Paper text:
Prions are lethal infectious agents that cause fatal neurodegenerative diseases in mammals, including scrapie in sheep and goats, chronic wasting disease in cervids, bovine spongiform encephalopathy (BSE) in cattle and Creutzfeldt-Jakob disease (CJD) in humans. They are devoid of nucleic acid and composed principally or entirely of multichain fibrillar assemblies of misfolded, host-encoded prion protein ([name]), a glycosylphosphatidylinositol (GPI)-anchored cell surface glycoprotein containing two asparagine (N)-linked glycosylation sites. Prions propagate by means of seeded protein polymerization, which involves recruitment of [name] monomers to fibrillar assemblies followed by fragmentation of these elongating structures to generate more seeds. Different prion strains produce distinct clinicopathological phenotypes in the same inbred host and appear to be encoded by distinct misfolded [name] conformations and assembly states.
In this study, we present a 2.7 Å cryo-EM structure of [name] fibrils present in preparations of infectious [name] mouse-adapted scrapie prions, the most commonly studied laboratory prion strain, purified to extremely high specific infectivity. We determined a 2.7 Å structure of the single [name] protofilament and de novo built and refined an atomic model in the cryo-EM density based on mouse [name] sequence (residues T94-Y225). Our model suggests that there are 15 inter-chain β-sheets in the [name] fibril. Comparison of the cross sections of wild-type [name] and aRML protofilaments show they are remarkably similar with the exception that residues 226–230 that are disordered in the wild-type [name] fibril, presumably due to the presence of the GPI-anchor, are ordered in the aRML fibril.
Residue numbers in the entry:
A (entry chain B), B (entry chain A), C (entry chain C): 94 to 225
Write the structure that this text describes.
C-alpha cells in the first residue's frame, strides 16, 4: 500500500527574471563584442511529496562548445564606444537681496562668448589620410 | 507500506535573477570583447518528502569547451572605450546681501571667453596618415 | 514500513543573483578582453525529508577547457580604455554681506579666458604617421 497525503497551506513561490542568457539592458557592438556558446539555467523547487523507484534518467549528456575569434585579414581604423556623456553644466549665477535701500543702482552683466568648441564628441578623423 | 505526509505551512520561496550567463547591464565591444564557452546554473531547493530507490541518473557528462582568439593578420589602428564623462562643472557665482544701504552702487560682471576647447572628446586622429 | 512526516512552519528561502557566469555591469573590450572556458554553479538547499537507496548517480564527469590567445600577426597601434572622468570643477565664487552701509561702492569682476584646452580627452594621434 502506498499513501501520499499532501496539504500545503498558503505557499508563495516567486520566480522572476530567469533566463538562459540574460542581456536585458546590455549595450553590445564592436566587431564581435559578445560571443557565447550556450547558456542554460534549471532552477528546481520541491516541497510536495515525491516517490520514485527503478528509473533511469538524464544519462549520457554532452555539451561541446567552440567559440572562435578567427578572422584572416582584418583592418580596423577607428573602433570606439562610450556609455554616457552626462551631467555637463555651465552657468553664471547671481543672487542679490536688499531688504531696504534708499539711493542705489545695481548692475548685473553676464557674457558667454566661445565657452566650448567640442563638448561630447566621440569619434572623428580630420584632415587624415588612410591607405590600404 | 509507504506513507508520506506533508503539511508545509506558509512557506515563502523567492528566486530572482537566475541565469546561465548574466550580462543584464553589461557594455561590451572591441574586437572580440567577451568570449564564453558555456555557463550553467542549477539551483535546487528541497523541503518536501523525497523517497527514491534503485535508480540510475545523471551519469557520463562531458563539458568540452574551446575558446580560441586566433586572428591571423589583424591590424587595429585605434581601439578605445570609456564608461562615463560625468559631473563636469564650470560656473561663476555671486551671493550679495545688503540689509540696509543708503547711498551705494553695486556692479557684478561675469565673462566666459574661451574656457574650454575639448571637454569630453574620446577618439580622433588629426592631420595623421596611416599606411598599410 | 516507511513513514515520512514533514511539517515545516513558515520557512523563508531567498535566492537572488545566482549565475554560472556573472557580468551584470561589466565593461569589456580590447582585442580579446575577457575569455572564459565555462562557469557553473549548483547551489543546493535541503531541509525536508530525504531517503535514498541502491542508486548510482553523477559519475564519470569531464570538464576539459582550452582557452588560447594566439593571434599570428597582430598589429595594434593604440589600445586604451578609461572608466570615468568625473567630478571636474572650475569656479569663481564670491559671497558678500553688508548688514548696514552708508556711502559705499562694490565692484565684482570675474573672467575666464582660456582656462582649459583639453579636459577629458582619452585617445588621439596628431600629425603622426604609421607605416605597415
Amino acid at each position: 500500500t502506498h499513501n501520499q497525503w499532501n496539504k500545503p497551506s498558503k505557499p508563495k513561490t516567486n520566480l522572476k527574471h530567469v533566463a538562459g542568457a540574460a542581456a536585458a539592458g546590455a549595450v553590445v557592438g564592436g566587431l564581435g563584442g559578445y560571443m557565447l556558446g550556450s547558456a542554460m539555467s534549471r532552477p528546481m523547487i520541491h516541497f510536495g511529496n515525491d516517490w520514485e523507484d527503478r528509473y533511469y534518467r538524464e544519462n549520457m549528456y554532452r555539451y561541446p562548445n567552440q567559440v572562435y575569434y578567427r578572422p584572416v585579414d582584418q583592418y580596423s581604423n577607428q573602433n570606439n564606444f562610450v556609455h554616457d556623456c552626462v551631467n555637463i553644466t555651465i552657468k553664471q549665477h547671481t543672487v542679490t537681496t536688499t531688504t531696504k535701500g534708499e539711493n542705489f543702482t545695481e548692475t548685473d552683466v553676464k557674457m558667454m562668448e566661445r565657452v566650448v568648441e567640442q563638448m561630447c564628441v566621440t569619434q572623428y578623423q580630420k584632415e587624415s589620410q588612410a591607405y590600404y
